Amino acid sequence: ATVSMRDMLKAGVHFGHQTRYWNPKMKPFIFGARNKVHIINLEKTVPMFNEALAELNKIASRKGKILFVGTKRAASEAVKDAALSCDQFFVNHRWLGGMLTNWKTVRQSIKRLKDLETQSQDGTFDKLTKKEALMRTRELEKLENSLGGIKDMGGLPDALFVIDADHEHIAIKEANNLGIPVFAIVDTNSDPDGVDFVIPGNDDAIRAVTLYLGAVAATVREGRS
RNA sequence: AUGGCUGUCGUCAGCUCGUGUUGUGAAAUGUUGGGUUAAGUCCCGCAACGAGCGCAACCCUUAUCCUUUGUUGCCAGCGGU
């Protein structure tokens, strides 16, 4: 249910950012400065990695629903790969400011969406003009581009897994105003002071991210057993 | 002192709200930006997400044809003038 040290070195989780982009609040996680870029100390990661998955395993044991939030080009598809396979929810393209804190109004949008899939199956678009049809279908891809992963959820999730905390300060802050636990893959540029459970590591690699959420897909299945 | 009604800015494209969020606060954000349009018209991006009054459309008339009717309307195809 855990990962080893050498395979993490294979995915390049030690390759952080330059010294021109590091957040001074992560000095306890910096080994040294090789080639002018900070290198993450791996032996500090694995225990904190297990502190995260063990905590996430109990949340998954009580029939809990977690959220996978990754917006960058690396996890634009990787997040979805884990989601439906691990029976969870997600967002991968656009995080609407006020997705959880303003859940009362965004819930209006998901019912607005579920009407579109229903009208697309029975044959409601093939009785009216293309003027009203094609723009309504373009409204359907617009709504599934963001709400397509949390349409079949209902209510705000129990926990939350986020990638690149710097790029998702609007996401983790919404969980802080609710008290929802945060499991972040914090990088050298991000801030660790807003996360409940930090995991120092690189996120700018498709093989690195799949090593992360691919592993948490196993622990969530351990909770669903 | 007012209702009703009316002009005007101006048929100019703007004016706001709910919720969330930022700020001690007045307020801001949304409604900013890149293009576009007659138009916060539309698209993308975005701590914004949506909704309403507007704009547009639905109304009337005019320009084309078809179906239906032919009086007191009209005169091609045929007779008497």
Side-chain angles (χ1 to χ4, degrees):
Chain A
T2 182
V3 69
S4 67
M5 194 200 287
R6 62 174 63 76
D7 46 22
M8 290 190 77
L9 201 70
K10 290 286 123 177
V13 300
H14 55 286
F15 288 124
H17 296 269
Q18 296 172 294
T19 61
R20 295 180 58 251
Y21 291 93
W22 79 299
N23 189 46
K25 273 72 176 186
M26 290 181 76
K27 202 171 185 62
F29 307 123
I30 304 301
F31 175 65
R34 196 197 307 123
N35 301 309
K36 292 179 62 179
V37 296
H38 274 179
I39 304 301
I40 299 78
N41 186 281
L42 272 64
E43 59 258 46
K44 296 300 179 184
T45 307
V46 277
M48 292 167 71
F49 186 68
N50 279 87
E51 295 189 318
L53 279 71
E55 181 63 45
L56 190 156
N57 207 319
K58 191 256 290 184
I59 298 301
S61 179
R62 63 186 195 68
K63 302 288 91 173
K65 51 183 62 178
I66 62 177
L67 182 62
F68 290 104
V69 288
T71 62
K72 298 306 295 181
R73 66 187 69 184
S76 296
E77 183 66 42
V79 175
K80 193 252 286 185
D81 292 313
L84 75 162
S85 56
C86 71
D87 302 314
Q88 290 306 299
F89 312 107
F90 75 97
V91 305
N92 56 316
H93 282 186
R94 174 92 169 76
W95 168 272
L96 301 182
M99 193 164 272
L100 272 68
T101 57
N102 189 9
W103 176 260
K104 185 63 177 61
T105 63
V106 73
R107 191 185 293 183
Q108 297 292 87
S109 298
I110 58 175
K111 286 187 178 298
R112 159 74 268 196
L113 173 59
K114 293 177 65 177
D115 289 336
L116 291 179
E117 269 74 41
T118 303
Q119 292 168 300
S120 68
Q121 293 303 90
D122 70 314
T124 309
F125 297 128
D126 287 315
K127 66 90 174 183
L128 46 80
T129 73
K130 269 68 69 176
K131 175 68 176 181
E132 312 168 305
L134 273 65
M135 67 177 184
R136 260 186 163 186
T137 59
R138 275 187 291 126
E139 189 175 315
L140 188 153
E141 59 212 49
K142 189 66 172 180
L143 294 187
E144 68 83 40
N145 191 290
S146 295
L147 289 302
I150 54 180
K151 43 172 286 298
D152 58 355
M153 175 168 75
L156 50 90
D158 302 344
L160 183 151
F161 190 69
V162 57
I163 309 296
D164 199 297
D166 180 30
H167 206 71
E168 309 308 303
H169 48 282
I170 49 180
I172 62 176
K173 194 185 299 296
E174 284 187 51
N176 289 173
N177 289 125
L178 294 174
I180 306 300
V182 186
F183 303 106
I185 296 300
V186 60
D187 212 335
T188 52
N189 62 326
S190 300
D191 192 67
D193 299 325
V195 191
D196 293 25
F197 288 106
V198 288
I199 302 176
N202 177 67
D203 70 289
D204 303 319
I206 64 175
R207 188 170 64 186
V209 59
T210 58
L211 187 146
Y212 292 129
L213 92 174
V216 307
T219 187
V220 66
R221 274 191 281 276
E222 204 296 309
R224 292 288 286 184
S225 60

